[PDB]
């Protein structure tokens, strides 16, 4: 991916995070678990539903379009009519296939950027109260109980509070 | 639709495509 996160420094995905597209896995003395990140999953679902609606709205429905009949003395306009019908089909087929190919690439890069944005948000929060251990994990220098973990996932982690409590 | 270019009523646009699947989610990597 263009942003190095998905299939990048975060080596793989989580079948155990079921409530969203991006999120957290935590691990402290009380226990472990997954939790989707609602705010960022929501923003992506906004954009992707918008993307799909955009594709729909641009392909107005085809109304009644039947063929025509020609005599054995009208083959030039018969072939012209065939040329027109075939031509437009070749063009909408190209348009349809190309749009989906290009939008598919952008959609995947979009998800990749969203994961990277989330990781950097947490990194910016924890600063040097935790060790960046690669694979997208932060190892805390202080005890981080469930309330501590919950505050990281809310974006209201308290870097001054824990900077004095390092192990 | 790829069924037929002649249509009566309110139909999808005809294309010659055989596949047109549009990603909504991300790259699926369950086992590493």
């Amino acid at each position, epitope marked *: 991916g263009l942003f190095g996160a998905i299939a990048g420094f975060i080596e793989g995905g989580w079948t155990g995070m*079921i*409530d969203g597209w991006y999120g957290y896995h935590h691990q402290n003395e009380q226990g472990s678990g997954y939790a989707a990140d*609602l705010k960022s*999953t*929501q923003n992506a*679902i*906004d954009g*992707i*539903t*918008n993307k*799909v*609606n955009s594709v*729909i709205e641009k392909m107005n429905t085809q109304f009644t379009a039947v063929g025509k009949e020609f005599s054995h003395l009208e083959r030039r306009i018969e072939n012209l009519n065939k040329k027109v019908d075939d031509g437009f089909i070749d063009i909408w087929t190209y348009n349809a296939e190309l749009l989906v190919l290009l939008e598919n690439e952008r959609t995947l890069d979009y998800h990749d950027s969203n994961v990277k944005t989330l990781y950097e948000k947490v990194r910016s929060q924890l600063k040097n109260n935790a060790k960046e251990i690669g694979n997208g994990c932060f190892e805390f220098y202080h005890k981080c109980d469930d309330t501590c973990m919950e505050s990281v996932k809310n974006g209201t982690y308290d870097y001054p509070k824990y900077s004095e409590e390092a192990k | 639709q790829n069924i037929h270019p002649v249509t009566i009523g309110e139909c999808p646009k005809y294309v010659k495509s055989t596949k047109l699947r549009m990603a*909504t*989610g991300l790259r699926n990597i369950p086992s590493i």
Partner: antibody
Amino acid sequence: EVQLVESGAEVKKPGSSVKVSCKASGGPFRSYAISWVRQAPGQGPEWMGGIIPIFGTTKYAPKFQGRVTITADDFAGTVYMELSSLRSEDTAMYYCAKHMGYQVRETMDVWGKGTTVTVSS
Amino acid sequence: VLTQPPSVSAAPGQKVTISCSGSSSNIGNDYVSWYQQLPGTAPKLLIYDNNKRPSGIPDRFSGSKSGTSATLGITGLQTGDEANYYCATWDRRPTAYVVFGGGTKLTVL
């Protein structure tokens, strides 16, 4: 705003099943969940279950767990609700309501006008 | 389930309060919403996330949550405010689901 429009009234016999629908304006894909809530005469609302956009996952209340099936035709901007083994106690007004976001939750901010299902012998 | 008083009454211009009492599985660990219901019409959201109002709900409606009990408040009571009021929340009891209170009928004199 958003308009939720339920399908017509239904009158069905016990043990049969009914499939009502809810058509939403705009879209047709939505970024918010939709659930179904019913309310029997002289009673409070009771949630039945809901469905999540893109993921398509569903949650059902324990009381209807096992005989309710919520589905979605996002291209038609429509959501369906099928309830089976109908009892007389199922006679109520059925509403579809949307949630503020993509997860089903206690907060449903916009409701349809409701449709009635009557279950009698 | 959530328990509310079955019925409360007051004269116009007064302030009433509707209590919603649950357990640690519902109200004590999740947000609380309130709905108003008029005869013949669908439930109308008044309060979400314990104490926030949607657009269009007047200043005199308010809510709060203390530990295990939530509370709806209405001031400047009007004749049009005579309806059924329901609290709702996200119960983690058996399988998680949305649970409504029993309801509270507000009568104006």
